[PDB]
């Protein structure tokens, strides 16, 4: 299928302590595989899934020096942004970044990403063309002109089309009997009496990966978006996920209702009713 890599970076300033905390998490196919954190005793990119221990000390030392560079980059940028937004001292501030690449099933670059947010808010992003920048804020225009005049987009384009792709290829080959799995959901339906003449039927899906899933209810034919309650997909804590969707229903006439579970690990959508 298709594949991806992302680095998610964060720097947080606080009123007191004299330097921002910086954290970077790498993901391959939306699963964590590296991590650097400046608060750690040994600030260094540590590995995060079994398959990454294949890398020699030369890989970790280079990546760690890279993170130290980013930390200092985030540090100066935080300073500059404070001035750009005429923010005084004595506050908390956040600078975040997402970057990476999406491959197709043919292992070629589909899309590159480079995005920044300040205070949790879109600040500047490299457009899909990997040549021009989107920056909504008036304050962000200063950064955008600076980066337009410096050929920054060329530098990021080369990483995204080159290193990002080349090294993701490499990471997939090393953990092939690892990230080439999906756990299908196990669904069941439970029954919950309420205000009589009526009853809540609750469709459960358990033990699935990845997290994307859809649960529908049907009154013998047409789907029910009202008032179908659901929860947001949640981690079970063991790598798998959980979800439920419920619909309230006349007591006795409940065998009319059907629940469907759509997941990318199923050979086909599952179909389910209440079983007394």
């Amino acid at each position: 299928g298709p594949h991806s890599m992302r680095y998610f970076e964060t720097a947080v300033s606080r009123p007191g302590l004299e330097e921002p905390r910086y954290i970077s998490v790498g993901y391959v196919d939306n699963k964590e595989f590296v991590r650097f954190d400046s608060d750690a005793e040994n600030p260094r990119y540590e590995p995060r899934a079994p398959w990454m221990e294949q890398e020699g000390p030369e890989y970790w030392e280079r990546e760690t020096q890279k993170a130290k560079g980013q930390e200092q980059w985030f540090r100066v940028s935080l300073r500059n942004l404070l001035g750009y937004y005429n923010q005084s001292a004595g506050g908390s501030h956040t600078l975040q970044q997402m970057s990476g690449c999406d491959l197709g099933s043919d292992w070629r670059l589909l899309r590159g990403y480079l995005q920044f947010a300040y205070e949790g808010r879109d600040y500047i992003a490299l457009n899909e063309d990997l040549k021009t920048w989107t920056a909504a804020d008036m304050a962000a225009q200063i950064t955008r002109r600076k980066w337009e005049q410096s050929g920054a987009a060329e530098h990021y384009k080369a990483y995204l089309e080159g290193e990002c792709v080349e090294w993701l290829h490499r990471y997939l080959k090393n953990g092939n009997a690892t990230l080439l799995r999906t756990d299908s959901p196990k669904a069941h339906v439970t029954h919950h009496p309420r205000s009589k003449g009526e009853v809540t039927l609750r469709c459960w899906a358990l033990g699935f990966y990845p997290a994307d899933i859809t649960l529908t209810w049907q009154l013998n034919g047409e789907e029910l978006t009202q008032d179908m309650e659901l929860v947001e997909t949640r981690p079970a804590g063991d790598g798998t996920f959980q979800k439920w969707a419920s619909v309230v229903v006349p007591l006795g006439k409940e065998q009319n209702y059907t629940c469907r579970v759509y997941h990318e690990g199923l050979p086909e959508p599952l179909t389910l009713r209440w079983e007394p």
Binding site: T10, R35, D37, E119, R121, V231, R234, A236
Partner: protein
């Protein structure tokens, strides 16, 4: 500016009274990343709660999974209480084994 956290409290496994399990408190969709999470048994802080590392979603908002070992009973009630700058007061949600 602030984004207020959404909380769910639920067990890892199908809950059975008298059988050890893991209780989760999944806190999502918040900003700034500084947050206080306590899990509670009968209103009292459970002392050794595991905290996953800070991560964020593609919409920039932060999330955390807190968890602890526990043994559901018929009588004890569990909860998660979250303190964050988006809220003037802490927000509690109680564990319901059916949801």
């Amino acid at each position: 500016i602030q984004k207020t956290p959404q909380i769910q409290v639920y067990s890892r496994h199908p809950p059975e009274n008298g059988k050890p399990n893991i209780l989760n408190c999944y806190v999502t969709q918040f900003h700034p990343p500084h947050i206080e999470i306590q899990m509670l048994k009968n209103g009292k802080k459970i002392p050794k709660v595991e905290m996953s590392d800070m991560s964020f979603s593609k919409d920039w908002s932060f999330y955390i999974l807190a968890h602890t070992e526990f043994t559901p009973t018929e009588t004890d009630t569990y909860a998660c209480r979250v303190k964050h700058d988006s809220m003037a007061e802490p927000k509690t949600v109680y564990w319901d084994r059916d949801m």
